[PDB]
Amino acid sequence: LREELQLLQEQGSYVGEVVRAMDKKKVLVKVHPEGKFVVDVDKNIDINDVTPNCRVAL
Amino acid sequence: VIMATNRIDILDSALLRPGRIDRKIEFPPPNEEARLDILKIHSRKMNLTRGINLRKIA
Amino acid sequence: QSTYSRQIKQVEDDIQQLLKKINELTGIKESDTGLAPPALWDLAADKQTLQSEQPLQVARCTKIINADSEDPKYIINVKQFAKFVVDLSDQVAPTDIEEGMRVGVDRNKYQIHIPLPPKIDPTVTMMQVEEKPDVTYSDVGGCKEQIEKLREVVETPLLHPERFVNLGIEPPKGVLLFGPPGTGKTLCARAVANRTDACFIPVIGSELVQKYVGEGARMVRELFEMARTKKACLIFFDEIDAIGGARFDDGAGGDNEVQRTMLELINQLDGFDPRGNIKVLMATNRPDTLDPALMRPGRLDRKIEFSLPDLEGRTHIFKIHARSMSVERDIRFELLARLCPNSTGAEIRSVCTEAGMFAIRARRKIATEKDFLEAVNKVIKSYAKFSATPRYMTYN
Amino acid sequence: TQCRLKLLKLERIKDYLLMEEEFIRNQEQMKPLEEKQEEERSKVDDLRGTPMSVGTLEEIIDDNHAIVSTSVGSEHYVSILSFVDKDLLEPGCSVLLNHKVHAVIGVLMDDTDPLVTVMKVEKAPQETYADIGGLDNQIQEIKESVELPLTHPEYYEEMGIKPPKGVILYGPPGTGKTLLAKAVANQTSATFLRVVGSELIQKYLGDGPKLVRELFRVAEEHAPSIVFIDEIDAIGTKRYDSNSGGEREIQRTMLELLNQLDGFDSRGDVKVIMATNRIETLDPALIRPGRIDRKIEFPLPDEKTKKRIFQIHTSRMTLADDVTLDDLIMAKDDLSGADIKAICTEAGLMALRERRMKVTNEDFKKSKENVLYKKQEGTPEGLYL
Amino acid sequence: APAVDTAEQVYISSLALLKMLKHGRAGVPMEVMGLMLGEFVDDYTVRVIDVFAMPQSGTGVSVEAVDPVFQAKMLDMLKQTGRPEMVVGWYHSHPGFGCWLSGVDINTQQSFEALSERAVAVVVDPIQSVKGKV
C-alpha cells in the first residue's frame, strides 16, 4: 500500500487499436477519438507479434 | 448470403433466377401441425385447468 | 481440368503462407531513412525545440477589423476551430496579410510569424478545379468556320484587350459555347488556351449540386473570386445541366439544387464590381435549353456556333485525324467520308483509329487500305445503335 | 499426375529452405549491420522523440520547410530538419513529427486511401484463360483493346495518335464479362479497382459523381490502371427516393463520366472497363467511341458456340465425358449464358436432395426438361396466357 | 569541466520543500521561480534552507524575470537580519512543461550560474502536490 503511492503515478494507460503493423519496425496505433501516432517497437512486441486490426493495451 | 422473405411477389426477378439459386426451399402458409407444436411447448410453462384442448385452437 | 486445378491450388497455398513470415521478419532492420547529409540538421532541429516560434500553426485570415490598439487586428480561424484575433506580422508587410489569405501564426504565442501563399478558405472549391493538359489544333479536326469563331471570340479580347477598345465594347464578361456533343469542343477549347496564354480552369456541374443546397452557393462565389485574382483567365464550365439545364423549380425535386447554384452565378455575372476582360465560358446543347433568366444577353456577348459535322464538313475533319496519325493507305479521305451517314463526327474519327486495331488483327503493325474499308462498315452500325432510352412518354 | 509430382515436391521444399535461411540472417549473421545499427536506432529514436505524431506530407518547400497536416485535427507549418531530405519525402504519405516541437523527422511509412481499400479486389480469373472459350473471338479483343496499349507500345507508337481508353462489354450475362476484365488486369498487374454501379445511386445525393471522380483520380495516381464498373443498369432502375430516381440523378452520373474519360480533365493510359447488361439504360454518349474505343458485343450463343460455353461451366464443376451436348443444343438455343448456368445448377440441385454428391448425364437430363419450361415461366404466364 | 564539476545531492528542509510546492500551486498555469538560500559544504553537499520567489508571469519562466536587482535587493535584507546565506541555486515550477528543462529555463540557469559556480536547477510539480505522490 505504501509502495502503491509511487506505483499509481503515470501519464495514464489507454486502449488503442493497431490499424496496421508496419515492416519498418515501428507500429501505427490510433487511440480511439484522437489521431494516429507512430511509436517504435517495444521489447514486448516486434512485427510478428502485432498484425493488422488488433485492439491493444497501451 | 441466405435470403428469407414473406412472399414471392415482393422479390426481384434477379433473385428468382435459377442459375443464382442453388436451392429453393418452399414453406406453406400456417398449418395445423405447426400450431399444435407451438401451443404444446408454451403450455408447459403456462398454467392449465381441466378441459382445454390445444387441438381446437390449432 | 477439375483434378489438375486442385494440385496447383495446394502448392501455391503452402508457398504463400511461408512468405508472410519472411516478409514481416526482415523489415528495414533498424536502419535510418535520412542517411548521412541530415546529421548537421539534427543539431539545428534541437535548437528549434527550445524555440517558441517553431512550430507554427497554419491558419487563414477570415476578416479585417480595426479597433487597433497595438498593430493591426485580424481574425483568423485556427484549425482546431477556435477563432482568435492576432496582430500584424513581427516584421513582415501588412500588404501580405489580406482577407482570404493564408498565414502561418505561432502555435505557442499566436501572432503572425510569416504570411503564407493565399487561399485555403473553401475546402470544396479547391477540390472542384482539376488538372489541365494542352492538345493543339492539329489534333482537333477541322479548320472550318465553326472552329474559327471559338478563337476570335475567346483568344482576341483576352490576348489584346486593345482590339476590343478600338471597336468600342468591353472584353466579354460572358461567352457562350454551344453545339451538340461528339464534335471535339473540349478539344478545341484546350487548343485555344495554349495560344492565348489564358489559363483555363475546368469545372463540373455534377459536383456543384449536392443533397443540401448552399455548399454549391459558397463554392460558386469563391470560385469567381479566385479567377478574379487570376488575370486574363477563362472559367470553363464543362458538362453542365446544372447551370445549363431548364429553368423551372419543382420544389420537392433535385431541381432546388440547380436553382440556388444558378442564382448565385447570376449575381457573379454582373459582379460586386464588373468583370471587364474576365471570361466565363459555358457549354450547353443549344442556347434555347439555357435559362432566359441566367441568359441576360448583354453580358454573355457572342454565342459561338459549333454544329454537327456535315457530309462535306466530316470530309474535312477526317484528313486532320488521318494526317496526324501514321497510316499507310491507298484509298482517299473523301470516299470514306461520303461512306458515313450524318450522325456524328465521332464515328468518322473512330475509323482512322479502328483501321490501326484491324492491322494487329490482320497481323501487320500499321494500317492498310483494306483495314480502312472494313472499319467504316462496322463503326457506322456499332456506335449509333445499341444505345438511348426506349421511352419519351410521361416525363416533365 | 505422376509427371507433375516430382517438380511439385521439389518447389515446396526449395521454399522451405528459403524460409529457414532468413532466420539465421536476422538472428546471428551480421557484417554491415552489427551492434552498430542497433545503436543508430536508439540514438535516432531518442532524438526523434517517441511518440511521433502523424502528419501527412502534402508538399515539400526547398528552404528547410514543408507544409504538413497533422492528423490529430489541426494542421502545422513545420520545418524539414532532422533525419530526412526534401527529396526523401514523398507526396501523399504519412510522416513522423517530433512530438515536443513539430519538425518533420521523415517518411518511413506510406498512406493508403480509405476509399481504395473497399473498392479494390484482387486480379485473377477463376476460369483460366483459354477456358473462357466460347465466343473465343471476342475474348481476344479485350486483350487487344485494354491490355495491349499498356503491355506492348510498339504498335501504338508506329500507328500514331491517341491510344484506346476503354472497352464496353455488353450483351446477355454468362458470356463472362467479369472474367475478361480480371484477365487483362491480372496480366498487366494494373491495380484493379472494382465498384458495382449501384454504389453510384445510394440514399445520399451526389454520391455518384463524387465516387466515380475520386475512383478515377485514385486510378491515375496508382497508374497504370484498370477500373472496372460492374453492371451499370441501376441508375434508372433503383431509387431510395424521388431525388434518387429521376433525371437529376441519372444525368449527373452520365455527365461526370463524359468529362472524366476523354474531356478536359482527361485520364492517362488508365482504361475503364464497363460491364453493362443493358445499353438501353446507357446513352449514345457513353457508347460513343474515343472514350470507349472498340465496343465488344456478345450475341446469344450459337448452336456450335453453345457446346464451348457449356464446357466452361462443366470445368468449374466435375469434368464431363458422358454428357450429350446435342440434347442441350436441340432443346433450347439462342438463349443466354445465363441459361447454360441454369441447366447446370438444376442438375446439382436434384443430386443434392438424394445426397448424391456428383452430377452425371442423368442429373443433367432430368433437370433439363423442367429448366426449359421454367425459362418461359420466369417471365409471367398469368392465369393461362 | 570533468575535472571539477560533480553533482549536488540536495538536502531539502521543511521550510524550502513546503514553500516551493505552495507557491507553484496557487499560481497555475502562471509559473513561479526564485533563488534558493542555503549553505554549501563538501564539494557536493548543499543544504537548501529556505527560498523566496521571483516574478510570476503568464508565459512562465523567462529572461525578463531574472534580474540582478531582485537578488541584490534580497542580499541587503540578509545583512540586516544577520542571516549569512549565500545563493545555492535556483528553482522553478513547470505545470505547463514536464520535468524536461524548457528552452527559456536553460537561459535563466546560465545567468544564475555566473553568480554562483555551484548552482542547482529544480522542477517542482505543483499539480502533483494535490495528489498523495509528489
- Residue-wise DSSP of D292-305: S-S-EE--PPPHHH
The answer to whether D50 faces chain A, any CB pair under 8 Å, is yes
Quickly count: other Cβ atoms within 10 Å of residue B9's Cβ. Answer: 6
Adjacency order of strands within the sheet including C199-204: C199-204, C233-238, C279-284, C174-178, C303-304
Say if CB D203 and CB D239 are below 8 A apart. Answer: no
Say if CB C100 and CB C61 are below 8 A apart. Answer: yes
Q: What is the DSSP letter of D145?
A: I
Kindly report whether the peptide bond that precedes residue D51 is cis, defined as omega within 30 degrees of 0: yes
The answer to whether D108 faces chain A, any CB pair under 8 Å, is yes
Say if CB C108 and CB C52 are below 8 A apart. Answer: yes
Q: C229 vs chain E: nearest CA distance in angstroms? A: 41
Tell me whether residues C24 and A25 touch, CB distance under 8 A. Answer: no
CA D79 to chain centre: 40
Tell me whether residues B19 and D342 touch, CB distance under 8 A. Answer: yes
Say if CB D129 and CB D183 are below 8 A apart. Answer: yes
CA distance C180 to A46: 63
The answer to whether A14 faces chain D, any CB pair under 8 Å, is no
Q: D73 vs chain B: nearest CA distance in angstroms? A: 40
Tell me whether residues B22 and D342 touch, CB distance under 8 A. Answer: no
Please report where in the chains the cell 512530438 appears, as a residue.
D99
Dihedral over Cα of D205, D210, D215, D216: its sign: positive
Say if CB C177 and CB D264 are below 8 A apart. Answer: no
Q: C109 vs chain A: nearest CA distance in angstroms? A: 24
Tell me whether residues D50 and A28 touch, CB distance under 8 A. Answer: no
The answer to whether B21 faces chain D, any CB pair under 8 Å, is yes
Say if CB C348 and CB C183 are below 8 A apart. Answer: no
Binding residues of D: 171-178
Name residues 120-159 of chain C within 8 A of D (Cβ). 130-133, 139
Q: B19 vs chain D: nearest CA distance in angstroms? A: 4
Residue of chain D nearest B16, judged by CA positions: D378
Residue partners of E6: CB distance under 8 A and separation at least 6: E43, E44
Resolution (A): 15.4
User: Which residue from C348, C396, C356 is spatially nearest to C376, judged by alpha carbons?
Assistant: C348
Say if CB A47 and CB C27 are below 8 A apart. Answer: yes
Residue of chain A nearest C28, judged by CA positions: A24
SS3 readout for chain B = CCCCCCCCCCCCHHHHCCCCCCCCCCCCCCCHHHHHHHHHHHHHHCCCCCCCCHHHHC
Kindly report whether the peptide bond that precedes residue B28 is cis, defined as omega within 30 degrees of 0: no
Residue of chain C nearest D203, judged by CA positions: C211
Rg of chain B over all Cα atoms, to the nearest angstrom: 18
CA distance D385 to E65: 101
The answer to whether D40 faces chain C, any CB pair under 8 Å, is yes
CA distance A19 to D4: 42
The answer to whether C346 faces chain D, any CB pair under 8 Å, is yes
Q: Can you count the helices (H) and strands (E) in chain E?
A: 3, 5
C-alpha cell at C302: 457572342
User: Which residue from C11, A48, C31 is spatially nearest to D22, judged by alpha carbons?
Assistant: A48
Residue partners of D227: CB distance under 8 A and separation at least 6: D193, D195, D215, D216, D219, D270, D271, D272, D273
Residue D129: burial class (beta carbons within 10 Å; 0-12, 13-18, 19+) = middle
Q: What is the DSSP letter of D87?
A: T
User: Which residue from E89, E87, E81, E125 is spatially nearest to E8, judged by alpha carbons?
Assistant: E89
CA distance E32 to E52: 10
Quickly count: other Cβ atoms within 10 Å of residue C120's Cβ. Answer: 16
Tell me whether residues C24 and A23 touch, CB distance under 8 A. Answer: yes
Helix locations, chain D, DSSP H: 2-27, 36-48, 114-119, 136-142, 148-151, 154-159, 177-188, 207-221, 234-237, 246-261, 303-316, 325-331, 337-354, 361-378
Q: In Å, what is the CA distance from D118 to each residue of D37, D114, D121, D183?
A: 39, 7, 8, 21
Q: A13 vs chain E: nearest CA distance in angstroms? A: 18
Say if CB C177 and CB C257 are below 8 A apart. Answer: no
The answer to whether A26 faces chain C, any CB pair under 8 Å, is no
Q: Give the strand pairing for C83-87 and A54-57.
A: unpaired
Say if CB C197 and CB C170 are below 8 A apart. Answer: no
What dihedral do alpha carbons C371, C376, C378, C380 form, nearest 10°?
Answer: 160
Q: Give the strand pairing for E45-53 and A15-21.
A: unpaired
* C392 HSE (CA, 13 A, CB side): 1
Say if CB D123 and CB D192 are below 8 A apart. Answer: yes
CA distance D312 to D126: 11
C-alpha cell at D379: 417471365
CA distance D350 to D139: 33
Chain C residues with at least one Cβ partner in E under 8 Å: 49-52
CA distance C249 to C259: 7
Residue of chain D nearest B13, judged by CA positions: D378
Residue of chain D nearest A25, judged by CA positions: D108
Residue partners of D356: CB distance under 8 A and separation at least 6: D363
Say if CB D193 and CB D220 are below 8 A apart. Answer: no
By Cβ distance, the residue of D50, D73, D109 closest to A35 is D73
Quickly count: other Cβ atoms within 10 Å of residue D276's Cβ. Answer: 21
* C317 HSE (CA, 13 A, CB side): 29
Which residues of C fall within a CB distance of 8 Å from D84? 33-34, 38
List chains touching B (3+ CB pairs under 8 A). D
Tell me whether residues C357 and D88 touch, CB distance under 8 A. Answer: no
CA D140 to chain centre: 19
Helix/strand/coil for D34 = coil
Residue partners of D95: CB distance under 8 A and separation at least 6: D54, D55, D56, D57, D68, D89, D104, D105, D106, D107, D109
Q: In Å, what is the CA distance from C254 to each residue of C208, C214, C259, D250?
A: 12, 13, 9, 11
C353 is annotated as contributing to ligand binding:
no
Binding residues of D for ATP: 171-178
CA distance D304 to D150: 34
CA distance E74 to E97: 28
Which residues of E fall within a CB distance of 8 Å from A5? 132-133
Which residues of A fall within a CB distance of 8 Å from E132? 5
The answer to whether D70 faces chain A, any CB pair under 8 Å, is yes
Tell me the β-bridge partners of D191. Answer: D225
Helix/strand/coil for C200 = strand
Give ∠ CA C14-C18-C20 in degrees, rounded to 5: 120
Chains C and D touch (3+ CB pairs under 8 A): yes
Residue to mutate among D16, D252, D293, D297, with most C CBs inside 10 A, is D252
Number of residues in chain A: 58
Residue C81: burial class (beta carbons within 10 Å; 0-12, 13-18, 19+) = exposed
Name the experiment that determined this structure: cryo-EM
Tell me whether residues D345 and B21 touch, CB distance under 8 A. Answer: yes
Query: Domain extents for chain E?
Result: 9-134
List chains touching E (3+ CB pairs under 8 A). A, C
Say if CB C208 and CB C216 are below 8 A apart. Answer: yes
Give the DSSP letter string of E40-87.
EETTTEEEEEEEEEPPPBSS-S-TTT--HHHHHHHHHHHHHHT---EE
Q: Kind and range of the H or E element at E31?
A: none
Residue partners of B31: CB distance under 8 A and separation at least 6: none
CA distance D55 to C269: 41
C365 is annotated as contributing to ligand binding:
no
Kindly report whether the peptide bond that precedes residue C341 is cis, defined as omega within 30 degrees of 0: no
CA distance C314 to B26: 62
CA distance D281 to D9: 53
Say if CB C124 and CB C214 are below 8 A apart. Answer: no
Chains C and A touch (3+ CB pairs under 8 A): yes
The answer to whether A34 faces chain D, any CB pair under 8 Å, is yes
Q: Give the strand pairing for E86-93 and E121-124.
A: parallel
The answer to whether D100 faces chain C, any CB pair under 8 Å, is yes
Q: What is the DSSP letter of C278?
A: -
Please report where in the chains the cell 507553484 appears, as a residue.
E24
Which residues of E fall within a CB distance of 8 Å from C46? none
Which residues of D fall within a CB distance of 8 Å from C44? 81-82
Q: A36 vs chain E: nearest CA distance in angstroms? A: 23
Tell me whether residues A25 and C28 touch, CB distance under 8 A. Answer: yes
Say if CB D295 and CB D301 are below 8 A apart. Answer: no
Which residues of D fall within a CB distance of 8 Å from C26? 22, 25-26
First to last CA, chain D: 56
Q: Kind and range of the H or E element at C358?
A: helix C345-362
Tell me whether residues E128 and A9 touch, CB distance under 8 A. Answer: yes
The answer to whether E103 faces chain C, any CB pair under 8 Å, is yes
C309 is annotated as contributing to ligand binding:
no
Q: D54 vs chain A: nearest CA distance in angstroms? A: 5
CA distance E72 to B52: 107
C389 is annotated as contributing to ligand binding:
no
User: Which residue from D232, D205, D113, D251 is spatially nearest to C216, judged by alpha carbons?
Assistant: D205
Helix locations, C160-240, DSSP H: 161-167, 185-196, 205-208, 215-229
Q: In Å, what is the CA distance from E65 to each residue of D48, E34, E57, E102?
A: 31, 9, 8, 15
Residue partners of D317: CB distance under 8 A and separation at least 6: C2, D344, D348, D359
Quickly count: other Cβ atoms within 10 Å of residue E66's Cβ. Answer: 22
D70-79 b/e with 16+ CB inside 10 Å = b? Answer: bbbebbbbbb
Say if CB C347 and CB C182 are below 8 A apart. Answer: no
CA distance E54 to E64: 11
Residue of chain A nearest C29, judged by CA positions: A25
The answer to whether D172 faces chain B, any CB pair under 8 Å, is no
The answer to whether D342 faces chain B, any CB pair under 8 Å, is yes
CA distance E20 to E52: 9
Greatest distance between any 2 Cα atoms in chain A: 43
Q: Give the strand pairing for A54-57 and A15-21.
A: antiparallel
Residue of chain E nearest A8, judged by CA positions: E133
Which residues of A fall within a CB distance of 8 Å from D111? none
Say if CB C74 and CB C97 are below 8 A apart. Answer: yes
